[PDB]
Ligand binder design. Structure first.
Ligand code: A1BDJ
Ligand code: ZN
Ligand code: ZN
Length: 582
């Protein structure tokens, strides 16, 4: 309690000393309360007019249009302590997993220089507005780094003053850029040096890209075993136990010198003890603490989520295989059986999984996995939309498994080569491309965001008739040389001014390890679509009157957007499609 968080609390107390009141009508049951103080403020979703003008048929589809319009009672729940058998399974598994992840990697500190390059090329690092405007300005000023230095030396002393979370099934915990630096310095190596790559972790997919995930799931499907399981956890971040946070900290056992002490302090002072500020309407700022749950930077959150998910799923596999009999207590010889399973088959069992933070697919040895629920439930990783003790539904076909919000099709080219392509309901793809975040967008910046979605569709979703047509229309309506942009950046090969056919060939043919024949494709007409009925099943409007009129009259829509943008240099991309080619 207060010896580790007090200083941070003490400090905030004084910045609002003409406001501090121990409110008595405070809602928190599971968050420890400390006090309140005066504040007054809230960024909703804006429409991208370039994408909307070129997707007119979707103006009357509520699944698209409702996406642009508009539980914090899950953060305020608690998770019971796991039993001694569960705690032992996790500690053995975590010890073993860090060693395996560390065999071909060296933990190291990330640098001011690396941090500065990050901010000067924009990533969602989750900082705040104060003393400096943007992140870009604070990183150039030496005052900031003196602030960073004071905290840095405070952390080496086992103490914390300024590392405080700000809240805003989603809950995002912003910190000041300084606290974000110190987290990146100590733990950025997990992401920067690709600890969760598939090559390094066997279960992981970090840095893969949507064009690889289907091939990875098809490779898991080739293993002998049972159904493919893809259980979602109900609110994963809220189910992270203090025992989980202590198993994650064991990465520090692999460190040395300064780095070890700096990493130990992030885990002790900011992860295993937290201070948060929350906006209440009744409008005060509440200063609450708790020891458990996930509240880190989103990039460190991804790697530690992947780690603890890999651990949980290996333990569920051990349970299905009868490695241990009960979670109440491991015998002395059960401990040696678990250790020996890990050493003997651990790497094979990791290769049976695809894990992306809280998202997993597992192809276990057999279907005993389906009813192996005691460890999973007792670790607190309770499955979503199924009754606590009901067996998991198994998927018989890798093409029907959900993963990273997608499913995957096998698509055969006219020349016999096999593509495994990513897919999701087309209403979701169109509805997302019609949304922008934040204020002060010029027409040119709105156009370049539309172009980013269009190029993503040409590379990932070329097999959907409506998206290849709409992508060609947007790229025809935006000036040819204008550069695609985003405000929150997986691999993003569509973010380029290179010819999209050249990028398609590099991604799907040249650099694709599942494609033996490297013959380049010479035109978009060589590049296939889903079957017409499969395209409709996944949300295509082909066969509707609205869609036929849109496709026939597309040059009129393109010219409407060109007239709004004005006299600029444009290319007509529609003749790359058979139907507009004379
Ligand atoms: F590009 C296309 C693709 C399909 C289509 N219509 C067909 C959809 C399936 O039932 C027969 C008609 N029109 C244009
Ligand atoms: Zn601190
Ligand atoms: Zn599909």
């Amino acid at each position: 309690n207060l010896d580790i968080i007090g200083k941070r609390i003490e400090k905030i107390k004084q910045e609002h000393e003409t406001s501090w009141h121990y409110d008595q009508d405070h809602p928190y049951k599971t968050w420890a309360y400390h006090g309140s103080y005066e504040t007054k403020q809230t960024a909703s979703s804006m429409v991208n007019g370039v994408v909307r003008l070129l997707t007119k048929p979707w103006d009357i589809i509520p699944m698209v249009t409702q996406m642009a319009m508009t539980f914090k009672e899950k953060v305020d729940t608690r998770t019971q302590e796991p039993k001694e058998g569960t705690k032992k399974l996790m500690k053995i598994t975590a010890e073993w997993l860090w060693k395996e992840l560390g065999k071909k990697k060296t933990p190291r500190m990330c640098t001011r220089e690396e941090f500065t390059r990050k901010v000067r090329s924009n990533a969602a690092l989750g900082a705040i507005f104060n003393k400096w405007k943007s992140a870009r300005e604070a990183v150039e000023d030496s005052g900031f780094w003196e602030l960073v230095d004071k905290e840095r030396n405070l952390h080496l002393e086992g103490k914390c003053e300024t590392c405080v979370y700000n809240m805003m099934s989603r809950a995002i915990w912003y910190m000041w850029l300084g606290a974000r630096f110190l987290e990146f310095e100590a733990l950025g190596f997990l992401n920067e040096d690709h600890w969760f790559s598939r090559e390094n972790s066997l279960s992981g997919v970090e840095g893969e890209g949507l064009h690889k995930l289907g091939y990875i799931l098809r490779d898991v499907s080739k293993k002998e075993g049972g159904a493919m399981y893809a259980d979602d956890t109900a609110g994963w971040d809220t189910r992270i136990t203090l025992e989980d946070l202590k198993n994650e900290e064991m990465v520090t056992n692999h460190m040395e010198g300064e780095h070890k002490k700096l990493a130990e302090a992030i885990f002790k002072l900011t992860y295993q003890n937290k201070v948060v500020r929350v906006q209440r309407p009744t409008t005060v700022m509440d200063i609450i603490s708790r020891r458990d749950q996930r509240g880190s930077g989103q990039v460190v959150t991804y790697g530690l989520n992947t780690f603890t998910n890999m651990e949980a799923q290996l333990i569920r596999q051990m349970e299905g295989e009868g490695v241990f009999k009960s979670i109440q207590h491991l015998t002395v010889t059960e401990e040696i059986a678990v250790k020996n399973w890990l050493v003997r088959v651990g790497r094979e069992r990791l290769s049976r999984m695809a894990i992306s933070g809280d998202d997993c697919v597992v192809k276990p040895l057999d279907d005993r996995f389906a009813s192996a629920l005691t460890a999973l439930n007792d670790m607190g990783k309770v499955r979503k939309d199924i009754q606590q003790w009901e067996p998991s539904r198994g998927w018989n076909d890798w093409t029907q498994v959900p993963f990273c919000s997608h499913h995957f099709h096998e698509l055969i080219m006219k020349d016999g080569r096999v593509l495994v392509v990513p897919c999701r309901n087309q209403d979701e793809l169109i509805g997302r491309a019609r949304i922008s975040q934040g204020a002060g967008w010029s027409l040119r910046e709105t156009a370049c965001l539309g172009k980013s979605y269009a190029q993503m569709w040409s590379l990932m979703y070329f097999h959907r008739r409506d998206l290849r047509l709409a992508a060609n229309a947007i790229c025809s309506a935006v000036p040819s040389h204008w550069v695609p942009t985003s405000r929150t950046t997986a691999t993003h090969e569509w973010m380029t001014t290179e010819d999209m056919l050249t990028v398609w060939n590099r991604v799907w043919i040249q650099e694709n390890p599942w494609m033996e024949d490297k013959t380049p494709v010479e035109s978009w007409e060589e590049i296939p679509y889903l079957g017409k009925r499969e395209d409709q099943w996944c949300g295509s409007l082909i066969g509707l009157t609205s869609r036929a009129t849109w496709a026939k009259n597309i040059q009129t829509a393109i010219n409407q957007v060109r007239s709004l943008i004005g006299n600029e240099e444009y290319t007509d991309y529609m003749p790359s499609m058979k139907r507009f080619r004379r």
